[PDB]
Scaffold this active site. Structure first.
Site, PDB file in Angstrom:
ATOM      1  N   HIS A 157      38.085  -4.717 -19.190  1.00 15.89           N
ATOM      2  CA  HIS A 157      36.728  -4.432 -19.699  1.00 15.89           C
ATOM      3  C   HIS A 157      36.116  -3.209 -19.000  1.00 15.89           C
ATOM      4  O   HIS A 157      34.992  -2.862 -19.384  1.00 15.89           O
ATOM      5  CB  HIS A 157      35.854  -5.693 -19.691  1.00 15.89           C
ATOM      6  CG  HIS A 157      35.340  -6.074 -18.348  1.00 15.89           C
ATOM      7  ND1 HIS A 157      35.579  -7.315 -17.819  1.00 15.89           N
ATOM      8  CD2 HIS A 157      34.596  -5.394 -17.445  1.00 15.89           C
ATOM      9  CE1 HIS A 157      34.994  -7.407 -16.634  1.00 15.89           C
ATOM     10  NE2 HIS A 157      34.389  -6.239 -16.375  1.00 15.89           N
TER      11      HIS A 157
ATOM     12  N   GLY B 263      28.976  -4.836 -10.928  1.00 17.25           N
ATOM     13  CA  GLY B 263      29.812  -3.917 -10.129  1.00 17.25           C
ATOM     14  C   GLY B 263      30.891  -4.634  -9.308  1.00 17.25           C
ATOM     15  O   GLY B 263      31.790  -3.923  -8.775  1.00 17.25           O
TER      16      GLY B 263
ATOM     17  N   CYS C  53      33.114  -6.788 -10.380  1.00 15.79           N
ATOM     18  CA  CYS C  53      34.318  -7.114 -11.165  1.00 15.79           C
ATOM     19  C   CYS C  53      35.478  -6.283 -10.599  1.00 15.79           C
ATOM     20  O   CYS C  53      35.289  -5.165 -10.094  1.00 15.79           O
ATOM     21  CB  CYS C  53      34.118  -6.964 -12.671  1.00 15.79           C
ATOM     22  SG  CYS C  53      33.245  -8.371 -13.410  1.00 15.79           S
TER      23      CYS C  53
HETATM   24  C1  T2G Z   1      31.648  -8.301 -12.551  1.00 13.19           C
HETATM   25  C2  T2G Z   1      30.888  -7.106 -13.058  1.00 13.19           C
HETATM   26  O1  T2G Z   1      30.912  -6.056 -12.425  1.00 13.19           O
HETATM   27  N1  T2G Z   1      30.248  -7.223 -14.243  1.00 13.19           N
HETATM   28  C3  T2G Z   1      29.600  -6.088 -14.897  1.00 13.19           C
HETATM   29  C4  T2G Z   1      30.268  -5.825 -16.225  1.00 13.19           C
HETATM   30  N2  T2G Z   1      30.211  -7.009 -17.084  1.00 13.19           N
HETATM   31  C5  T2G Z   1      30.880  -6.748 -18.361  1.00 13.19           C
HETATM   32  C6  T2G Z   1      31.201  -8.022 -19.098  1.00 13.19           C
HETATM   33  C7  T2G Z   1      32.510  -8.446 -19.256  1.00 13.19           C
HETATM   34  C8  T2G Z   1      32.784  -9.632 -19.910  1.00 13.19           C
HETATM   35  C9  T2G Z   1      31.746 -10.406 -20.397  1.00 13.19           C
HETATM   36  C10 T2G Z   1      30.424 -10.021 -20.234  1.00 13.19           C
HETATM   37  C11 T2G Z   1      29.296 -10.869 -20.748  1.00 13.19           C
HETATM   38  C12 T2G Z   1      30.172  -8.828 -19.574  1.00 13.19           C
HETATM   39  C13 T2G Z   1      30.807  -8.165 -16.406  1.00 13.19           C
HETATM   40  C14 T2G Z   1      30.146  -8.420 -15.073  1.00 13.19           C
END
Ligand code: T2G
Ligand code: T2G
Lengths: 304, 304
Positions: free
Chosen positions: B41, B143, B145
């Site tokens: 993602h 941030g 992830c």
């Molecule tokens: C963990 C992190 O940095 N995040 C920021 C980006 N977000 C994107 C996302 C991915 C999958 C599902 C959702 C609802 C959002 C995730 C959290």
């Protein structure tokens, strides 16, 4: 979201741990620049520990009696000195992994990370608080002495603790890196009882703020209180008195949540008077007091 | 003595964290040898996240669109591929700090350390368990992830988790390092509810053993039970069923303490039926289930 008991990343401190052996005693040392810091009781036999005269014991020790091993490489000791309850061993090689560092003496209620080590080797990392009775509730087996406590500000390690002692009650005592014990403790196998382990009120309030930020809000009530009124309740429950300095320090969490500090005091008052009634806050069934207001901001803002 | 929620020392993993930026999205990656692993993602805008077609989105991305920064030095991306829900970015430089490592897919009830990172920079380390509903209760802001979970066996890091998702209930979902989600979760902004968060019974029993070893013994009673009888109580309290495999795994703690596993089951039964009556065990007012039997042995034996 979520709120965890979180330690600083330990890599910068891992790069500083060495084994110190004097005769048959092995514990951990901290190698910063060309100095290895370790507890002075490395020079004792357990026979010595009843009433050691460290100055007299140290007269019998030469540089070559301090065996310092960093990984599987031996360091050459070229000088040694006692400062309070630590030995400083001068080695011929600056630690190439020496981080930016300071030595700080923390106040009761301040939190820090411990890197538990055995034979100079890191076993684990956890978060502690200096208790108001100047003990810490750690996890330390024999060989763990010389393990250190620290805070990290971006790239600077502030070393605040070295492990020396377990009290017969299974709580922990140690020194700053100038070798001064926290509290009244001495590096002697003697009757040393901890005072009252009071709850760090400002830390509980910070953690209640952390709860609200993370969606745990059931304990918020319709009440306020005053510092004086709250403090009557704090006394009754062996909570530290809350000062205006504590209120000032909680200001940013007050601002972020829009809950006045004294309103959160009134929530804490009702929790002390009524208990949790079998409910939990941030996965705890008791009031957590080992997060500082600074800790809550950091974890809630994601500082690196 | 003392028993703490303890994470592995994080240095070996700290040396592996990088920043990955694709257009305007920045998260963390794991640099092992000449491959950077990150959540797929990274290629999405939050617009994409409702129903992303990752294969279609990835067609629009070239090697030069993946900005990989290790400290303040840029890595050259020379290939990219999708494996399940992770991207593998081939870089022209092997990570010089690559530790001995494995990729493992853990079972529910297994514990691991998380190194929370933001922009490739370590912020903190804590201990987690894979919950029986295949969520983890972490501490992750935007941030974070690409932050990873791991175990260390002497010098070998076993990577078991990469962070991808927060459920609307504030619990966490992610993948092994082959990019397969734990549980039924998908990397999509959609209705995903966690199942029953059951208590990890074998872990509670391990932690009761840890309590006895550390002098907390008030909960030991005059009773025994059977697996079948205990399991009737476990069901009622949303505890995982205890198996003979679980009993076998507790054997060493049984042996060390001389308390039969089924006797400790009967203590746990009475605690479930009667509660703590305002008492604590190892500083907790609830039954802790994020220590494995292996964890209790390690912390109680001081493994490095
Ligand atoms: C963990 C992190 O940095 N995040 C920021 C980006 N977000 C994107 C996302 C991915 C999958 C599902 C959702 C609802 C959002 C995730 C959290
Ligand atoms: C921390 C550690 O490794 N220990 C083993 C050595 N012990 C020596 C000692 C010093 C001071 C007081 C006592 C009672 C013992 C300390 C623990």
């Amino acid at each position: 979201s979520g709120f965890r008991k979180m330690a600083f990343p330990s890599g910068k401190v891992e790069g500083c741990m060495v084994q110190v052996t004097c005769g048959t005693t092995t514990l951990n040392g901290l190698w910063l620049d060309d100095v290895v810091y370790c507890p002075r009781h490395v020079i004792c036999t357990s026979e010595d520990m009843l009433n050691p005269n460290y100055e007299d014991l140290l007269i019998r020790k030469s540089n070559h009696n301090f065996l310092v091993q960093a990984g599987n490489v031996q360091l050459r000791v070229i000088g040694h000195s006692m400062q309070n309850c630590v030995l400083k061993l001068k080695v011929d090689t600056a630690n190439p992994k020496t981080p930016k560092y300071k030595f700080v003496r923390i106040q009761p209620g301040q939190t820090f990370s411990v890197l538990a080590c055995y034979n100079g080797s890191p076993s684990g990392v956890y978060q502690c608080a200096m208790r108001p009775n100047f003990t810490i509730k750690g996890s330390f087996l024999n060989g763990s002495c010389g393990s250190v406590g620290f805070n990290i500000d971006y790239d600077c390690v502030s070393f605040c603790y070295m492990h020396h002692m377990e009290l017969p009650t299974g709580v922990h005592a140690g020194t700053d890196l100038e070798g001064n014990f926290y509290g009244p403790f001495v590096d002697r196998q003697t009757a040393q009882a901890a005072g009252t382990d009071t709850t760090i009120t400002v830390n509980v309030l910070a953690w209640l703020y952390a709860a609200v930020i993370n969606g745990d809000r059931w304990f918020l009530n319709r009440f306020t209180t005053t510092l004086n009124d709250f403090n009557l309740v704090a006394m009754k429950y062996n909570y530290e008195p809350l000062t205006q300095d504590h209120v000032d320090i909680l200001g940013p969490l007050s601002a972020q949540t829009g809950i006045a500090v004294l309103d959160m005091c009134a929530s804490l008052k009702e929790l002390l008077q009524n208990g949790m009634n079998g409910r939990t806050i941030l996965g705890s069934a008791l009031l957590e007091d080992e997060f500082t207001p600074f800790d809550v901001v950091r974890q809630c803002s994601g500082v690196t």
